[PDB]
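Dear all,

This email documents one entry for the complex benchmark we are building for the journal club exercise. For each entry we list the sequence lines for every component of the assembly. Then comes the predicted three-dimensional structure of the complex as a token string, followed by one or two observations. Please use this as the template for your own entries, and keep the labels exactly as they appear.
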Amino acid sequence: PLLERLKRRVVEGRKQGLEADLEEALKAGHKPLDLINGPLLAGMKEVGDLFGAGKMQLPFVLQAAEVMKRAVAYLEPHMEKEGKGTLVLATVKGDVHDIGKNLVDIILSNNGYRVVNLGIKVPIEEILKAVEAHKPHAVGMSGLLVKSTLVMKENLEYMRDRGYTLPVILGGA
Amino acid sequence: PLLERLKRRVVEGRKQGLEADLEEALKAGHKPLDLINGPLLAGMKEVGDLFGAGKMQLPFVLQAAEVMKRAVAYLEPHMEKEGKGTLVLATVKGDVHDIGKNLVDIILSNNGYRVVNLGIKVPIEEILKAVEAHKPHAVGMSGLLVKSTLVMKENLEYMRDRGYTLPVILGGAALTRSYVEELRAIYPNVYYAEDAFEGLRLMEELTGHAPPELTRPRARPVGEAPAVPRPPFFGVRVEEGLDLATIAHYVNKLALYRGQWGYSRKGLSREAWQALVEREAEPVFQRLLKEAMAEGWLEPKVLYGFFPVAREGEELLVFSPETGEVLERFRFPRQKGGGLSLVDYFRPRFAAPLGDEADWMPKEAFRAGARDVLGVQLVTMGEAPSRKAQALFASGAYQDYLFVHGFSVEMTEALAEYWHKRMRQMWGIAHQDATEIQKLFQQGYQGARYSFGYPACPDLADQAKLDRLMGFHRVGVRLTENFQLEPEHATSALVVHHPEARYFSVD
Amino acid sequence: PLLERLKRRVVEGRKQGLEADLEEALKAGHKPLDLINGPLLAGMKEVGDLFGAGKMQLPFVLQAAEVMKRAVAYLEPHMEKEGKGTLVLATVKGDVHDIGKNLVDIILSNNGYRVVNLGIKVPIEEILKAVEAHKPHAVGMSGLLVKSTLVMKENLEYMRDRGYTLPVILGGAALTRSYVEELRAIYPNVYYAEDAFEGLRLMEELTGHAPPELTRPRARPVGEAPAVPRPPFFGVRVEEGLDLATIAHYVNKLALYRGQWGYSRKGLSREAWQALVEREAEPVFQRLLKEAMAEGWLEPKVLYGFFPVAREGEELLVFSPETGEVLERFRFPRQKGGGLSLVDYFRPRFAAPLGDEADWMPKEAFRAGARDVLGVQLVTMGEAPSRKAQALFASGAYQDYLFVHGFSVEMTEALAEYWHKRMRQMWGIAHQDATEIQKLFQQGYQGARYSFGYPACPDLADQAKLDRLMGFHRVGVRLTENFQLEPEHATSALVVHHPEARYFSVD
Amino acid sequence: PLLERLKRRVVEGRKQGLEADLEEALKAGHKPLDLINGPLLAGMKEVGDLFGAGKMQLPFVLQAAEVMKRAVAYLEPHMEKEGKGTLVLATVKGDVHDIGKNLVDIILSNNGYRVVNLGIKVPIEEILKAVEAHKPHAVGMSGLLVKSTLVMKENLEYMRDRGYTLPVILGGAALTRSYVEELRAIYPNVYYAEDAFEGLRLMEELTGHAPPELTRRARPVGEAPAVPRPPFFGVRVEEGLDLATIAHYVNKLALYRGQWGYSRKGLSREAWQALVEREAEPVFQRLLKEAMAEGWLEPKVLYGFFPVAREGEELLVFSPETGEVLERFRFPRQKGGGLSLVDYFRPRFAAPLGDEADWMPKEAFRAGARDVLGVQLVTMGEAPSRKAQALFASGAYQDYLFVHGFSVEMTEALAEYWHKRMRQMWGIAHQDATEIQKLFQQGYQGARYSFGYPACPDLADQAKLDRLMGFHRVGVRLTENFQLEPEHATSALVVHHPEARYFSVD
Ligand code: B12
Ligand code: B12
Ligand code: B12
């Protein structure tokens, strides 16, 4: 069917002829939010399984995310929308390095979570203002250097002192 | 490397960025004929393997040939010319049909053989003058109709009488394998070719690039009809000024996509076929209608009418509406052991009238004994599509050459079908027509149309009798000496009202 | 393990190190019969599956059988035996041809059936004595020519008259499937075998090791010739002392590699075939030439000549050069509905001479009315290659048996071809010969040679008329009761000068 | 084709009909070097992949190398010749052990590298003379014992002091990965090799044919029942030993799995039993028939008993004749005052348990000796070492493997057999095992402690044992790293105490 074909276009990373197949499938009788959480997300889920096992390489994972991002862009006019949960994601104060943080943003966003990317050199005052506004499931913090981890610690001390109990996912080189 | 990329460009059919990649390969130190007989020809051989196995469809084969033809055109200034061998290729005397011949030309030329295309209506005098000049490995001859095969025979008799022993590759719609084997009597070195790729294999074997393989009643008895239906008039009138959009609704989309364009339906689902039609087949059909309407390269005409007729034994007489005298007589063939004939759908001469037909049957004809009414139509799409197609083939758009041909042909058939509907309405026998367009192709209507040449009425020289009645000049149609219609995109038919009339084979 | 290694040795055909691996397996505690009916026969059955599917070629099948035969020879002193079933196998009375029969023997024996090979020229008296002694599951009979099938019929009539009901597997070159089905009239339990592997499957079903399946308008008229060419002499002379190197240039390498040795070409490229020839086919051909020259197991002889002839109606008369009296007449068959015959290539009796042939035609013959010249050749390679092959088969070199047979056969054909060239030169009709050796096999020369038995002149009893003219003893050749040439590697031909003469089929 | 057939002959290990197939390929057109660098080396690399994945066992790997070695020998007359690179390979100064080094030689040589095998007891002066001559890609050094690793360190100190920087691949039984990483201090370009195939991968990376990867706790011991009395005091020879009787004590798993590399695990018990019957057992049966008839095992034993005592942490050994203390052994104790070997010995001047004063040597007992220690040295002579070097030289690499491991496990079997015999003599064989299989589980009274093992690990105490026993008397010699020469020889201290079993200080 066309359901298996939309899953295929994610896993292979085939953009050219996608907008034709999306326009066709609504007519087959599935809604915009339907196809997103169905074959496409399994295709993405499948690409996650493949990369986990070392059978797909990282340039094709991001080629899959390009297809998913382009699918959601085509289906956004039809929708008047509310993902699986939110991550407020920032690089720490005194750090300019944004490849790891932005890689998280790509994977989470194209797996149906909401990512509020706050950029670089973000102090904890700004991060917790975002947590109040959005009310996410977790906070993310990216560093580079070991002095960036020391800022992350001061930020956890700040967060407990204010009385946040929300999960803090830390990552960094 | 870039060697594998030039092979890839042929097999995928990618023209955009070709002339960059050719220019890069020459500076990298590769000679013109090096690339030509190297990766490019390897690409065109792979496409032949794929088409042989049914993994590439014919529109992409001709898309590959476009790339190869465009490569050779770019490398011709650098080269100072001389292929693998030569075919002198012609359509026979009294024949105008050039799609098969030109399909051979495309495949052989882009597989590195030389093709000397001599055109249409080519006599054997002209063909053998070319054989003297070029000294080819083989001579090729394309027909259409069975009278074109009888010319091919006379040509082999001519060629043996002159003392040619060179291989003669024959191909054609009407030409069969069985018949070419019986022609080995006259000229032993004669080979049949079912398609262009059979023609390529023959040319491979004949030039030594292959191992020799190819080279070595109890039925329903006649019923009286309900009534003699009354025509709008008697005699024959012209009709131009027909909407191409109305005719396009009668196109047999499978006969066009599978039959003519070679888009394979077999091997995949009906949702998989439906998706191919939406993506590939339908938008090409939609583009060529917009074009043919705006550019004016289909010119639909119709010549049509009705006549007082009768059966007298095995002959169908045709009476003049004005004089009542017998104009033509058709002796149609009957099936084995009594069996069915077309004359069996017509009332006998001086038959006691079924209804009130003496009220309206032409006075003179009815006194002469005419008791039934026969419909006749010629349709045509003009010389224009033939011209448009020769333009594309000449410029080297071989894909579009294919598409535009088949479109024109199936649009011509669609007009015969549309006008049949219209011939029923006029006659007043369109009470029982199909609700869908799809069920008109299975004869979902009263009576039927019998074109001359088909088994029921197969003598093509009866088309001269039909022109004497109708006047084919009146829509720019001409008969050749092999009784083909000129232009090629035209089809005559006898329109029968009798409800029991359906198609049958004498052979 | 070593069990898988003994299976491997059969399928790959590795005899070097076999007797070590057999000795190791028995001391490991494996009995002789355990090995025979086990790891080995599994190997030989896999090779049968592979050959059935076209993944192993016939020179490696017989290389497998060499290993199996050598294994059983090593294990026979230890054993005191007893196969799966017995075939009594013979070549028929009045036939000397033993490659097919011996190929059956090799395949069946190395697949665990017992074969009682009775040799050549075996009458049914002798065959049925063997059936009484051994009490086999089936009788086998091999022929060559169509007169050998007529003996097989008389043998089935003999066998039913005696009251044998045992299955009779018939095979042969001339024997067809259609004919063996008509023989089920006489003897219902008769089966055709296209190859040895069909013979194995029959023997499987008949011994219960298999699911029963097998067991249940146009012509060209011939014109007068340009002139009557003059022969070097009239009558027949011998020629010995022919270079085998010169003859080897006329060998049809495909007919040898594909046709005889069973090296498959099809399904691979022409560069892939060319590489196989270089590695496998060509060095074997090169070895057997060096051998046949040094060891002297081809003895090329030729008996050849020319005669004053005429057509008188449908009979080709042959006049004596010395007396002028009619020696033989040949009534040759004509194609259906008065088509072509061989007599049509010969001038009529008392025909007014084309040129100045009365200057040189034998005085007596020409007064008697002879007006044309017929050439005749017999070639032979002697009893020697038949002897050499029987040696190899007996010693168990089944691969070399295959190679040496086909070599001898295709070298015999090459001599007929070489000598035809030489027969043209002598006659003075070699102006128009081929530039390549490859185009002599396409009849690239004036006239043609018609061997008796082929469709044009198929009566094999006319070979006795040819021996009365030529004297076949003069190159050690004899006719049997079924009109076969002894030795088997010999071929007669009628050599025609007329330029319009090419090959045709009455059937 | 014949190209795929020459590859097949390597991977299956089929030498019979090889020289026919080589002669056919070259007269067909192929060049010797072309065949060397192609189908043959492709074969040997596939066998390396298989062994890497655990699908081909070590006796067939060396059967593949036999074919490759025999191919190159046949094509050497045709060639007028330069491997992929060179390893200069030696066993260290004061070491005679050459099975590991020669196993490296076989694998590397038959994978198209050049190996300059310098033999045994090779000093660094000699090794670096070879490095100057040949200019190799790497230097290899094989040891056995931990004293051989200490020489390897001094060699790296020598090599850096001279200013060599080229890679040093170290391997050895006693050598560990952890130690070679600490040696990168002295000589940074030093790599450990667990097996020959690790040695091949290093040589691949170092010659550029691979991506840089590798290259970047008590119980109390109580008093004994009694002091058992020995047949005599002092040390005697025994040479009249049946090889058939010793063969009953061979640890067939240690031989088949441990030495020959026939893997058991991942198959059934009936599948292993069938492999033993077909492959392992008839080789064991062949080499016994050979070793008996050809005489290439010469079993000797030096054995005896001594008056001893504990004096604190020292085990004194008294003279049977003079009573004076000849040797003292300070054995190590487990962490935080756990077990020592001295704890199996009665204290000096201990009040006798039974009537040992009746028979203990008068002088020794007055000097205070109160317990009896047994001692044995076994050996199979220089003969098996010679037989193995013959096979390796001839190129029978499979038989080289088999004959080595046989000799080694037959040497251990003799230590075990003679232990049984040492119990009987002593009169402590009431409680022996009914099967031979349960003697490997220590199914007997007391235990034997070989020097070098954790309990008693100072190998320089083997010189104290030679001063007592006289190793020359069975043709055995100590080297400067305290190795027994010949290599197929093993000393043990034979303890009577029933509570004595094996323990680790580390
Ligand atoms: C569509 C079609 C038409 C079109 C004609 C368009 C055209 N001429 O291409 C239309 C609808 C207009 C039509 C009309 C008629 N038709 Co019409 N037509 C067909 C149809 C259904 C398919 C034609 C087609 O497109 N073939 C594909 C082309 C490309 O194939 P091809 O030309 O044979 O070429 C291939 C091979 O033969 C080979 N080849 C050809 N020549 C050569 C030469 C060489 C050297 C080599 C190597 C290879 C080679 O190469 C090609 C493949 O690569 C056929 C059925 C059939 N063919 O079996 C009937 C058929 C040809 N028509 C027939 C007839 C009866 C008629 C009419 C006489 C109707 C009437 N007026 O009474 C007319 C004739 C046309 C005319 N102009 O006079 C008959 C002929 C009967 C006979 N001879 O006795 C056929 C055979 C139908 C039948 N089943 O009996 N028709
Ligand atoms: C090469 C050949 C020759 C060789 C003969 C040597 C030989 N026989 O091996 C040569 C070049 C010398 C030659 C000469 C002639 N030829 Co010639 N020749 C051929 C050819 C091309 C191939 C024969 C061949 O060797 N096949 C391979 C062998 C192994 O096949 P086989 O014998 O049939 O056996 C197979 C099966 O039948 C089966 N089988 C056979 N017997 C049995 C029995 C049992 C129980 C079982 C289970 C299976 C079995 O096993 C084999 C496969 O595994 C054939 C064409 C053909 N066969 O279609 C003509 C053919 C046999 N030739 C023929 C003739 C005319 C001639 C001559 C008479 C020419 C002349 N003198 O005028 C002579 C005959 C020779 C003679 N001594 O009299 C004719 C016979 C026609 C007829 N009888 O009327 C044939 C059929 C050609 C034709 N198409 O008409 N020929
Ligand atoms: C067999 C053996 C014996 C033999 C030793 C002599 C021999 N092999 O001929 C016998 C049965 C005689 C015995 C006795 C002894 N042994 Co012991 N024995 C072993 C045993 C059980 C197995 C070793 C083996 O089979 N090696 C076979 C060869 C092929 O392996 P290898 O030398 O390791 O080589 C491999 C790799 O290291 C690599 N490699 C080696 N060198 C190099 C170099 C390079 C450049 C490369 C790339 C690779 C490389 O290649 C090989 C694989 O391909 C070990 C246990 C162990 N290893 O865990 C103890 C062991 C060697 N024994 C040891 C000792 C104590 C002794 C004795 C001193 C006992 C005594 N007398 O008191 C004697 C000494 C023998 C003598 N001649 O001096 C100790 C050493 C302790 C120490 N150094 O402090 C060990 C480690 C036992 C232990 N677990 O503690 N034993």
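Observations: Chain A is about 60% helix and 10% strand. Residues D 97, 99-101, 103-104, 140-142, 144-146, 169, 171-174, 193, 195-196, 199, 259, 408, 411-412, 450-453, 457, 459, 483-484, 487-491 surround cobalamin (ligand 3) (CB under 6 Å).
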